[PDB]
């Protein structure tokens, strides 16, 4: 079986075996939905090690990898002989004929955003930095503004999805699209994603767990990065998704979309505080930087000589000539250095 | 006809003195009217006007009534005080306009940069310029019945330093203010018509009542002061037109010190 929104139906229900990208399985392991099956050396030896490293989480094996999948630029030889190598050249070629992919799912558009250097949960020192969310950097800004400009220039529809893009590509309407290995069975040539501002596109590599085309897929994968296996991913994508829904449809600007994404990423912020920050960002984008700074600050808050006298009447102790004269004056006014009488 | 002119001049002097005294009292008595920095200029103008009604207008009035200048060895200091007060009043108006422009264009920077020290420094510079342009040339015999006209070079220099430069400054200030007001009013009007003139009319009427009045008061006096030295015109018309320059001293507080705050102060004081 393959119910719609399987990634969203599995949590509320938890099927015996689930086939889906590993980025979700991490979250399932946070609450205890996936059973810790004991693997064997025979199955580990016959499979690649990088897949195990990708599906690895907290030093324990969750499931057995199945296959590696990455997005690639699928173009029809009947329309153009050579595929474009730079994103800046796509808007031109288009207007010479008249690109179209899934704008709903954020996974297809994330490569364009991360092409200019956009990143999230930086993998430094061998570990992911949850607090370091750089989705508002200049790279993601440039990517998202280029995306919304292409959407406004009558190049890609704001409501198209995977189904419409597939129906248009199979019919020979669109010149090229961005699809992974799952689209080869239904569908020409395939190549790597074009570069943006000189930097290469960094698409996410989806390793599923329980030839020239393969070459292009592996090249797109190695030029990108593997998705983090942290539980926060389930939220991150959602946030990004909203941004797309808020960016492609033209509901708000790029800064507002990125601010909403950053706010939604932070899980520690309560619903009331989340709505408050959202409203503050809506009615005043000029100070969005300070708002995000304060939100990040609040995130870490809700995170789970001596004198001795022996006189006949006055006896005791109290507290080198400079001190000796002072002690003598004190003794005179009262009527280790020790003084007796 | 002389008695009527004397009565009119006396009434004008008394009205000027009363207005200046009321303004000074409303200022120094209450504290809510002195908190604002801009008011430091308003009083600085009123004080100037007061001097005009004390050491300028009465002497010339009694001289015109008598028909000559009885105060021997006093015309020099009289002209000195007259020029000082005129330049001081004009530069006070100029700095007030500049302050209002700075407050309307950039109020956030205005509230942080326009400190009492700045207003005091500006009032100083103004009075120091008025004193330098007035006494230094008169005491050194540079301006050369007291009916002698001023010299060409000194007349031109004083008219330029006292009137024309402040005139251009106030012109540009009020023009920029009117443009900002038009921009905002038309934005509001566009929003209204998209949801579903009288404001610009009032703004222009106020700007007129201010600038056109100031002009009709002072400009012709300086025009004659610049023309006659190079001469053509009788002294009677010159006096009739310079009396407007002094009446402007009394008309000033009626426009600059007659807003809601001053109205409430005068109502609660008397």
């Amino acid at each position: 079986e393959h119910p719609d929104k399987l990634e969203e139906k599995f949590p509320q229900v938890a099927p015996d075996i689930i086939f889906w990208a590993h980025d979700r399985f991490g979250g399932y392991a946070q609450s205890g939905l996936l059973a810790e099956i004991t693997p064997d050396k025979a199955f580990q030896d016959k499979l690649y090690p990088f897949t195990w490293d990708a599906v690895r989480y907290n030093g324990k094996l969750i499931a057995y990898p199945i296959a590696v999948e990455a997005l690639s630029l699928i173009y029809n030889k009947d329309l153009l002989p050579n595929p474009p190598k730079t994103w800046e050249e796509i808007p031109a070629l288009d207007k010479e004929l008249k690109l179209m992919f899934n704008l709903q799912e954020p996974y297809f558009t994330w490569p364009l955003i991360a092409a200019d250097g956009g990143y999230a949960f930086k993998y430094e020192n061998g570990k992911y930095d949850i607090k370091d969310v750089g989705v508002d950097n200049a790279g993601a800004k440039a990517g998202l503004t280029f995306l919304v400009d292409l959407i406004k220039n009558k190049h890609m529809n704001a409501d198209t999805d995977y189904s419409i893009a597939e129906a248009a590509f199979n019919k020979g309407e669109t010149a090229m699209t961005i699809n992974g290995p799952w689209a080869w069975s239904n569908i020409y040539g395939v190549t790597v994603l074009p570069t943006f501002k000189g930097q290469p596109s960094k698409p996410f590599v989806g390793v599923l767990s329980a030839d020239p085309r393969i070459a292009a897929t592996m090249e797109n994968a190695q030029k990108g990065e593997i998705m983090p296996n942290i539980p926060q991913m389930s939220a991150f994508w959602y946030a990004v998704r909203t941004a797309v829904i808020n960016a492609a449809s033209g509901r708000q600007t790029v800064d507002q979309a990125l601010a909403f994404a950053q706010i939604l990423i932070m899980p520690n912020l309560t619903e009331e505080q989340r709505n408050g920050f959202i409203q503050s960002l809506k009615d005043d984008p000029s100070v969005s930087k300070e708002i995000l700074a304060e939100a990040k600050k609040l995130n870490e808050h809700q995170a789970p000589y001596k004198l001795v006298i022996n006189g006949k009447t006055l006896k005791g102790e109290t507290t080198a000539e400079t001190a000796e004269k002072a002690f003598k004056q004190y003794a005179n006014d009262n009527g280790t250095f020790t003084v007796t009488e | 006809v002389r008695i009527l002119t004397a009565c009119f001049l006396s009434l004008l002097i008394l009205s000027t003195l009363l207005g200046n005294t009321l303004v000074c009292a409303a200022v120094i008595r209450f504290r809510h009217l002195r908190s604002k920095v801009t008011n430091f200029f308003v009083i600085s103008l009123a004080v100037s006007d007061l001097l005009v009604a004390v050491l300028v207008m009465p002497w010339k009035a009694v001289a015109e009534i008598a028909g000559f200048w009885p105060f021997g060895s006093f015309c020099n200091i009289w002209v000195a005080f007259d020029i000082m007060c005129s330049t001081a009043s004009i530069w006070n108006l100029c700095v007030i306009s500049v302050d209002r422009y700075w407050a309307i264009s950039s109020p956030f920077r205005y509230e942080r940069k326009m400190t009492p020290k700045a207003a005091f420094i500006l009032i100083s510079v103004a009075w120091t310029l008025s004193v330098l342009i007035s006494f230094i040339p008169v005491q050194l015999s540079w301006h050369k019945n007291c009916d002698s006209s001023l010299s060409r070079t000194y007349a031109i220099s004083s008219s330029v330093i006292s009137f024309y430069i402040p005139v251009a400054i106030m012109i540009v200030t009020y023009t920029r203010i009117y443009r900002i007001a038009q921009k905002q009013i038309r934005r509001i009007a566009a929003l209204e018509r998209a949801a579903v003139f009288k404001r610009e009319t009032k703004v222009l009427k106020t700007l007129s009542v201010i600038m056109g009045v100031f002009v009709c008061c002072w400009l012709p006096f300086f025009i004659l002061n610049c023309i006659l030295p190079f001469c053509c015109i009788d002294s009677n018309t010159f006096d009739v037109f310079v009396w407007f320059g002094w009446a402007n001293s009394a008309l000033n507080p009626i426009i600059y010190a007659f807003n809601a705050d001053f109205r409430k102060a005068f109502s609660t004081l008397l």
Partner: nanobody, 120 residues
Framework: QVQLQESGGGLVQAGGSLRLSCAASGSIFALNIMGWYRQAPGKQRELVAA???????NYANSVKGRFTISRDNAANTVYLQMNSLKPEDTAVYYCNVKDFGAIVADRDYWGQGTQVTVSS
């Protein structure tokens, strides 16, 4: 006359959010500044936020980022969103309207302020 009616004040837990509102009824010149000040018992009244008709906003160095000020261009109703409220934020918040009708002066309209309390 210009009447400023405030609302939204109340008791809130530390770290929560609150949206104060103030509606100004009356003829106001196009060039006007709407702001929020705060006064504490014993202390003096200090500026919290301000916004000019042109859209420019200004905040104090102590509340920058936590508080946001906005205004309805069509109704002259001013809203103040406060987030991450701290105990020291308890005070009477007064809405102030500075009107530049008379270019030679400015008139200040107040709304008597509203109480705000933060619990610890």
């Amino acid at each position: 006359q210009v009447q400023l009616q405030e609302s939204g004040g109340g008791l809130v837990q530390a770290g929560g959010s609150l949206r104060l509102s103030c509606a100004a009824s009356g003829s106001i010149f196009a060039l006007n500044i709407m702001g929020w000040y705060r006064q504490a018992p014993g202390k003096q009244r200090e500026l919290v936020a301000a916004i000019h008709s042109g859209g420019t906003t200004n905040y104090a160095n102590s509340v920058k980022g936590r508080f946001t000020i906005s205004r309805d261009n069509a109704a002259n109703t001013v809203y103040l969103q406060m987030n991450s409220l701290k105990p020291e934020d308890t005070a009477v918040y007064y809405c102030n309207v500075k009107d530049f009708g008379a270019i030679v002066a400015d008139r200040d309209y107040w709304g008597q302020g509203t109480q705000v309390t933060v619990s610890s």
